[PDB]
Amino acid sequence: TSILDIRQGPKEPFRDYVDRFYKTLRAEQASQEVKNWMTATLLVQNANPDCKTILKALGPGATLEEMMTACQGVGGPGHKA
């Protein structure tokens, strides 16, 4: 696969998408510096519309923990009916 191919499902929990993005990026053949740039751009870029809105709002200084918290329940809540 390619990191370029990883995108958040329409209703996928942000936490699940980040996990998939990380797993793919670990395997990607690129420089560390490039992997940093990929994370800094593609993770938010390829989030679904509803998460993407939240992530942009949080700003570039946000931590992963903060992103996770802000996107909790978007697409969800995902409990059995």
């Binding site: 996990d19 990026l25 940093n36 994370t39 946000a62 992963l64 992103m67």
Partner: peptide, 11 residues
């Protein structure tokens, strides 16, 4: 965030 943040989070 950077790849290093991912490594820290999941590592």
């Amino acid at each position: 965030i950077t790849f290093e943040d991912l490594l820290d989070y999941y590592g």
